[model samples]
Target: TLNSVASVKDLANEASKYEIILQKGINQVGLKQYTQVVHKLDDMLEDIQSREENSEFHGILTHLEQLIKRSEAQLRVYFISILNSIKPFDPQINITKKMPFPYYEDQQLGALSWILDYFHGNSEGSIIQDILVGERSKLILKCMAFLEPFAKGSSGMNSYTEALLGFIANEKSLVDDLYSQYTESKPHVLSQILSPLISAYAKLFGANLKIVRFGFFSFELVESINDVKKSLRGKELQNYNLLQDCTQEVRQVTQSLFRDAIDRIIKKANSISTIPSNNGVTEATVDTMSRLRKFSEYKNGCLGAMDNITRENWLPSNYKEKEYTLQNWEDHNVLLSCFISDCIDTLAVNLERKAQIALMPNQEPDVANPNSSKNKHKQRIGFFILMNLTLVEQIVEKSELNLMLAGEGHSRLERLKKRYISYMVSDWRDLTANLMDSVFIDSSGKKSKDKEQIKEKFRKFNEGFEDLVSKTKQYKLSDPSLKVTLKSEIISLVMPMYERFYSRYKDSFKNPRKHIKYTPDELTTVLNQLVR
Candidate 1:
């Protein structure tokens, strides 16, 4: 049975209020129109976010609803840009999978495999090569911004933080939705599929990209836009631990980004408070220096950790390539160094006071070297040595980039596995989006062969699925993301693809339907193949 077509009219209704304003601004702003619309949309976004906060929390698509509006506006803008560049495609045209198309089993599989490998198995995953130099180097500037902040809870009027309270309220829900969608959509799917695909999708639209990127009727939005095109119904999806590993590593990335943000905020505050005041120069100078030194020491420590990322010696080249920057990872050292420096300064002040009192002869029972060593001399390496040693251990253990330092132990494998799973979650979003894009063909305006084509496309889709599993295996040994969970998804996907591909040969195939006869008993029977 074909699922009823979804409608974007609801989106139109909610978004039409801004239509005239946006159009007028476009005329006024010309190509710079995006700037004008960003504010309006951002404001409307706040409204939508507010509504979401007030709506019933459960079973309601609050974030998804607001997200669709943003997606719709972006889509309109994209279309405008496209039309400006080329003759518009026939708006009345319909597209279907059945129309002339050459499906390559290998190309599709290879692309997916390469993507998976890059996400978890290689350092290429972290490379953001698109930005120009001096255009906010994430490694340098962001790290500086991250560690320079004075307080974790500092407030300001920045767009992100100053956005409507309702919008802020919805963030938690949106985050939950990002995770819940995967578990809901595929409860039986393995780890490899869950983490990377989800993470990628989240990154694109800030966790609600699926709802925003594609219109409700778009092929990229639905589970399957055309009912007739259900080709891979019997094809099985693979289940593997790759997805699990990817999720863990993605969490690390998320943490790093936040930690960086905190640094940025504190630095901003420090800058504001450092203004030179003529009336209170002495007090202001002390305050400014205190803030600066505190932040600097804090940042220096983070940067130091980042600097030592490559020096860990235990990490293999591949691991280094994935986690550390060839040019020193921004490990929040500068921010931390500032903190340490501030603490030391405070200690020195206290020590100075003690020296003054001791010289007055009121401080009795002072230690043997208190006169010189405690006042002007640096403390010998006893307690401080132990402290640095502990810090070093923590640097190696907790630092995300340094997690794979040895690149050989079980711990390293686990880290690689986690990173790869996040990549897989990222990929799944893309895969789903691609499948959805082909489903809708302006069915609202006119009908075309899209329905028939969708069915045909679905049939050929399993060919790609099977190939993904095989290619995944080929890279299993070298790729950190291809773990048992990924293998399991492969097997799961293979089960269905096998059924769809060999349905015609069901009577003549080896063991007949025996291969498809999976059950707890059957799984136990072959448990030996996996357990060891």
Candidate 2:
């Protein structure tokens, strides 16, 4: 409509020329002249090409719109090309090749930073942020593909915490390069990159952090991630959203791990079969201590906090009010000590429970007090628990592992020992209690039917003692002092009773071998071995 408009006509010529430039400048655009042409194209839009007088030239308008789109597309392709060049973690690489652990080499990162600046630096209202967010989603997907081994569960995954940290460190280092050194919009760039990336990391690995099998590493990880938070905080500024989210995640994952260990400890105790083998430690108890010992391997760390700070000091702020309230431990060290004591006490509790099961198998009619009656088999039930307690005691006392409850454990063992001895000694007394009784049999042997009483009495004495003597050989209480006392106590019990009964009744039969099974002297020798 206005042929006199020189600026509009000139804009038309420039628009066509840039189309040629868009094609020819493709090679140079990403390398050096992207911002040059991009800024040039931006000016073209707001310059005379976009003027009110040029509105009549709708033809140039369409052409310039297409040209800008084409240039932007080329810019995106360049961005992706740089991203593709980043060398991600390789599952098949030589272990010695771990020197190149980061995604990009040194120069490539500079190139990435140069491009990233335009994406964030310009008010260049194209798909810059959207493109970044999209590609970040893609990056997360590919990382997930490569990170399969870690998330699958514990079989092949020893270094999940380390592997993830290494990957994150590498990623963060690039931003460490981009935000602090290269990009003008460091605050904006770091937020765009890190917030989503970290949130993605936490979401992807959340389940892995919840398990306690990785417990030794868990507290260490909590600290390591917290350390990274310091680095991400930047030299001059802060990120409240990112930092607070990280703190909350660490708090929850740690709490979950602690609970996981507690549940697993109780389950391990529950699996110690009601009937036990006399050999040594129960297999379940061995594993319980092994798991408990793993936690002891960590010191001065709470949850994932690695070194230096006490949990009582660091945790309550992050943990809130109901946190340590739910638990028994005062600090990281105390918590580990609690685990050891819990395992020991729970194991013993379960041991005594199984002893009851053994004592009352198939609902057999047992004396409520097994020691009060002549149930010699029930004595073994008490011994079963005693021996196991002693074995656990020895391990806790002799092993170099520092158990806070070591002295308490020994006292517990000592109590069980005394009770078992009392129970056992009472069963033996039932056999001798009758031997010392005065006889009113047959007055003074008129027809001497009660003479049969004397022989019968001798017969009962020999029978009762013979069984007791054989059982004495199996009584391996292991303490020599205790064994010596058992022998003397039973001897003092038996000999006095035998001598009184023998003088009272032995005159009925002079033949020592026939009616009276053993002599007083012989009985003394036999009783010595009965408890030996």
Give me the candidate number with maximum lDDT: 2
Kindly give the number of clashing pairs for every candidate.
85, 5
* Candidate achieving the largest TM-score: 2
TM-score of each: 0.17, 0.56
lDDT accuracy of residue 418 in candidate 1: 35
Model 1 weakest 10-residue run by lDDT = 219-228
Off by over 4 Å in 2: 1-23, 26-34, 49-66, 87-97, 105-107, 119-126, 147-154, 159-161, 180-380, 387-405, 426-528
Query: Measured by TM-score, how close is model 1 to the native structure?
Result: 0.17
TM-score of 2: 0.56
**Cα lDDT over the full model 1:** 0.31
lDDT of 2 by residue, 1-532 (tens): 2324556677677666766666776565455575566666566665544346345567666776777777767777877776766444443242335654536666666666666666665655335655654665466446545655544123323343344445545555555665556545545544565555556555544554555454555555565456556555553233345446656766665555545554564466556555554524566566666655555455444323422233332222332321111223444444444445444554544554455555565553332243545344645655554556556655555543355544543454455455555555665677776665425443444535456767877777677788777765665776565566566767777788778777766777657467777879998887765666
Q: lDDT tens digits, residues 139-234, model 1? A: 222322322231021222121111211121222222233233543322222222222322332243223222333111111211111121132123
Candidate 1: segments with Cα more than 4 A from true spot: 1-322, 325-415, 421-430, 440-451, 475-482, 487-532
